[model samples]
Target: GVNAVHWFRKGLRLHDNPALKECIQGADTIRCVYILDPWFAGSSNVGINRWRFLLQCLEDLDANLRKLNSRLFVIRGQPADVFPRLFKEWNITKLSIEYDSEPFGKERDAAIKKLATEAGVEVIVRISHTLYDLDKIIELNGGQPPLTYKRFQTLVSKMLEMPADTITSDVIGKCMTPLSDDHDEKYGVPSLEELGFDTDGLSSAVWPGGETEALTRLERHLERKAWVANANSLLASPTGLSPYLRFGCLSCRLFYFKLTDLYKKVKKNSSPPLSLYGQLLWREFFYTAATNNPRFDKMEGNPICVQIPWDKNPEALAKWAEGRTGFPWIDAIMTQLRQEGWIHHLARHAVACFLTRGDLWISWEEGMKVFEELLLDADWSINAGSWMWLSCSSFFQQFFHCYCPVGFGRRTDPNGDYIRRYLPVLRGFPAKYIYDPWNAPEGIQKVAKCLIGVNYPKPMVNHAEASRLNIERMKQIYQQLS
Candidate 1:
């Protein structure tokens, strides 16, 4: 009987998983495994929130696999080191995995593939992580990087068709592989303590990670089509499937297909660049841009990135990071990100802008690092691409049009409900000064029981003055680049 091993990387779910489906094809027996690399624990800078969420994802995957008479084998150590032994012990004839486009993932996959080759195992790699195969998109673009979102969309829409869905549940019954009784118990999902992480400072309300949760959220959002179409309501704006998409708990193909069906039925459906389908395409755009350009995440030596001497203000960066920027709106959003490990799309834009070109004038790279540490949905391509957009570094060149920390949040939430919810220190402040509490009269501050610079910090820098200086500096840099 043919024995195969399905090594799960980012694609964690059972539904619409191409790699898992391929692994089960024509195989008499199969084993599923997820490797817990120490590099992610030691040097990845992944916080407790992300770690906890990932553990939940693994647990959920294991639970789902159990129903199919199969269990997810969670093994420790590097994939290169682990797979060779597994192949020998299990007498595996085939190894299957999803294609990873990021720099580190590519390198890791190459090493594992070499090991599998030496072991004489057939390797099947499928592309399911992104909406389109990034390499194909690059080739369609005449071997040149799309560099811009518009170019990426044009190239992809012309060349690529939505991939057919893979039903994992239908194929799971075919995986009749039984694990060896000698396998170690330590190979299962480890606890937070075992991973050297604690629940302290982690959000209790973190989005539960799993296919069940991901699908539930997607269905609810689809039902609320009217709410999602309204661009004005930041609360009801996006599908909130970013973390699921990032971790591969939900398949992007499934998401794209489901939304396309919704759009066809709904006459008043929103279109691209704003609709749910548009959001998925945006993810595709960044993946292609990142894959084509190695320096997409970096500023220096990056071809498309505008050369700007970004400020290295440690004090300013720290204040912004700690949510002490003296701007209530910015601080609240930052606080939400820190506490919840998530925020609205517009909220991310406001804070990213305030950190880079808007107020602090720091490098987008600096802001990207903070976001990487904090956001549960953080992806290398999207995070870097978004930071570049917000900073006017790449994709977007409108450096003059900056997000006013006070006014931007106020536009969506005039009463500052979002602000008060995140930053309870300003809960007592009246709606008049909710966005900009510093401008309120001293008596009002006293009445609110929150004094500026005492309870809540004063504004770090004047928004108007700082924006003016940033625009001038950006103009100078653009002139130099030109």
Candidate 2:
């Protein structure tokens, strides 16, 4: 029996998977491998919440495999370290993987492909992440990834929407891998404790990770009659399927088709909801932008990136990252991010703008690095690309309209309800004073059980004054760019 291994990079689900389909083509003894290096739990990045969500994804992946009487091999090591052992030990004749687009992931994959070739193993890699083959899309754009969002749209105008599966049954019919009793201990998904994570005060998850839920949410997304817009605190409804899409529990193509078909049934022709449609394209825009750049994540030597002499203040960066900035509006958003591992996209804009051009004048790279650790849907290509845009480093050139930490939040989340929920210290403050607690009298501080210097620190920067200075600073930087 010919052995095959499909590296479960991000396409962790079983549906709408093109490479997984090819993985089962001639694969007699198949291994679904998810490489986990436990030392990374505390060493590098990804806060506790993100790690738990990822494990949930893995645990669910194993569940789906078990339903088919198979199991996911939870190999714990680097891909570069483990594959050599797997290629030989499993007698792998074939290797399959979802195509990776980021420069970092791409270089690693290229090395693996070379290893697979050297070992005489046939490799099957298919693009399922984006709607179109990004490589072909780039080729269509005169062999370079289009810079603008509209340019990307124009290039794909001639191309129509795409192209998904008995994926499991055929594989089951072809062959089976015996699951040893020790498989649970050796190859099964490990708990956070097993992975050496401290679970002391950890709360239950607000969002569950799995393909079952991904499909359920897709149906539920259409079921809701609410699809209107506005505000940063209005989280989780606009795109409930974001995390699922990022983890590959949901397919972009499947989700898009189902959406259009249903909406088309409703109106059939009345200018289909372009807002939601544009959001999906936003992801593809970054994917297309990131495909060719080796230094997509770096400010140095990046062809399209506008280099800024951003400040290097670890103290400032940490405060911004840990919700210790002393501004309730900013701290509340950061608290939600740390506790829940997800935030509203507009909330992201608020925090990102605050960290970079708006106030602190810190680098967007640092902000993104922190986010890459915490945010549940923090994508490699998208996060890097977006941070630049938010910082006015790449796509966007508008740096003048800074997100005023207090004034903006007060307007968006009237009555300070968003602040009170995440920042409980400010809960007892009256609506008028909650957004601007420093302005409140000492008696209100006593009523709120919040002291400016004792319980909650003062605002890190005087926003109204700092923003005017930062905007002027930004103008000087852009002045040089022209």
Candidate 3:
């Protein structure tokens, strides 16, 4: 009935896409638009591997839309440059997109909405990435973001029930948007070379990206019902769906409903508020904290973040970043991260604890930056929050309970295969000496072909000595605050 467009932001898939559904209903003309800044690929915000995952996601969306006889208009520029052009060219009357709540997303959306208003355009924003209404959650907490999980949980428990997933496939199937044959010529998805990323050395996807893959994996995970709790073991398999969830290839509403439905059938007792994984609750905890706070990613201006005087040793930081920390456990995690763009959650905690609070005593912001660059599922709010948690900067506070990189890594993967798989340089060492290569006799080290400092870097710092000092330093900061 009216000319409309759906701008794809983080929400990539068609199923359960409320914004797209709104765009489709009563529309005479339609265009599915996605804009990306190719210049940003040079920036540190995202690395090649994460960018690789995104390309796959974009491809999947184009393919999905093609099933309904439509095409994704891949505009290669920042939204500021493209939005005005897009609306004018299409003579678009309405625009709909998934709600973005992070600081950058919030600002961008606000700017676009204001511009659209004056241009005689209607913008439809729908919340789908998270379960509860984010703004509403903040409203319940005395018009401020809740600082603690327990408080967040209590506040959310009183909130209205979560809505059912929007079944929009039938809707989209009916309203097939007509596109010019030349649309693909001008709006095709960019290739690796076009994006300026080289793929000569890149490995195949450890977890291939897309909605089809995500839904299939979800069913597979559900089929195995031993887990009545939220956990994963090393060498078992990484959580395959985190990237999918982060990209919005898998709708959180559908996932939430599926989980609750399963719980209803299995427990067969009470309809409890708590779901099994707690990813939704824990993830939203960070998003809520970031809703109204500026500098959520930094330590100095961030009110919730406890500012500790961290070391300015860029050399030490480099060692930590490049996985030359000489702690094989930490090294393996970083290696896994750099190569695969993924790592187990426990591994992240260990490395984060080592770099910021336990051994290196670097800034949590630095750790946050590297994670943003490398991680496929590095949700900005969650990354900063988790880094703060491990670094004793916010939410979590038991500074004394620092993770020993070697002990914790070995504790998780007792046989050391996880290390061997990622860090081939240390693959020769026996399980006993794997975690502590320096502890091995010089002769034994030679036999293993790892001459501690020469082959693998030696331990960057003495863990026991380093943690005690860091813990006391943390206490000093807490005292100043008190």
Candidate 4:
């Protein structure tokens, strides 16, 4: 049993995998391990949108493994109890796994490593996720983590060489060694029934998980030449890879390597353009921030921004959540998020500012929870940082810093095409009145079948009043903190 191999933790792939390659080498048999902890499965931390996407990724992983003649061993329970007991039963002498750098992950892995050592078994962690190891990232930065993206990007570009495309692994076709009869438990996936969700046809229009979908999205984006055709294209963000990266169904190395190949064939002249590479850098930047800051989820990077008092307006918060704020653009974007799990980047920023400034006093945490559940790429670092920027105190650092939520619609959705698609009430209004239905005459409201107070909710708060209040409050907080 000392020869038995176990795969768990992040880095799920058969390509460019240093950990899996090591496991197969000098070992006769390999068994994969995926722990489904009750803490995670029942976590309110995940919303319906993220939950659906995660399940799809799990299914994808199983399918990928099946192609290799191996089956995923799904275990349930805490790692502290599960790993030691399993090692003893299977005589597992060596445990090979890829490392995780998140705060909770580091603590969990440390405990697991201790357990393996006491049992006289070996535990090895490989680096296959980021382009560089955490320590490498630190060392390159003189033992300090880079807080800002500009500094982090400058260092990463200088220190690391992009890894080249190598052959995909043949980890498939390896004979699987099943655990003993006593260890046998039902291995089938638990349905929404087993998981105990109200499986009442709840689904997301945006994304459903699996490698097939990931690859399909990847291929589709490339075919459209989204990266080349439009500087501000949604595909520029690799929206497809977000869920895969979150669940370990896809590796960052593979993502970057594949994108690099695509870049060469398409935008060869500009190696890492401001738009595309900048997004990737944001990913790494946020990852590094979350990795370094212990209380990252709670505190925004700019401490001064935290002291600003968030509004305690439950009614406005509820309206924003329900997509009935009577603001066509705001309601439309929220409707899109509800109908489709995804929102465009522009919409994300617009909604973020609307909540932070347009409707004062609501905490970033409240808005972020909704985004966390709804966004396919809800990286905490980016989400939190973006929240700070939208909160006005941080945004005030730049020119034209405070945003008028209504003005944002005028600039971004001038034609009101986007709003009309989601909010049908806006469909009857001409483009001139679409952005400001409240300004239209009562006769127009009747003709358009749009009643400001009845068919659609009235504007929850006066935009000018709310914006003025937010700016003054933020100024006080920034002054106090300074």
TM-score of each model, paired residue for residue: 0.92, 0.94, 0.94, 0.86
- Residue 130 of model 3 has an lDDT of 85
Ten residues in a row with the worst lDDT in model 2? 225-234
Candidate 3 lDDT, 307-400, residue by residue in tens: 7889988999888888898898889888878877888787888889888888888999999988988988868889988899888888455555
Q: Which candidate wins on lDDT?
A: 2
Taking all chains together, the TM-score of candidate 4 against the true structure is: 0.86
Which ranges of candidate 4 are over 4 A from the true structure? 2-12, 41-46, 160-169, 172-175, 179-185, 203-205, 226-240, 267-271, 300-306, 392-400
Give one digit per residue, the lDDT tens place, for model 4 in 100-172: 7777788888898899899888877777666676677777888877755577778877663343232133443
Candidate 1 per-residue C-alpha lDDT over 417-478 given as tens digits, one digit per residue, 9 for 90 to 100 = 87788788888998899988988999999988999989989998988899889878877777
| C-alpha lDDT values of all predictions | 0.79, 0.82, 0.80, 0.67
Q: Residue 460's C-alpha lDDT in candidate 3?
A: 88
Candidate 3 residue runs with Cα over 4 Å from true position? 44-46, 160-169, 226-232, 235-239, 272-275
For candidate 2, lDDT tens digit of each residue in 104-223? Answer: 788889988888888888999988887877888898888989888778888777673454662576556766776677988888888888766788777787768888878888887877
Q: lDDT value for candidate 3? A: 0.80
Better-scoring candidate (TM-score), 1 or 4: 1
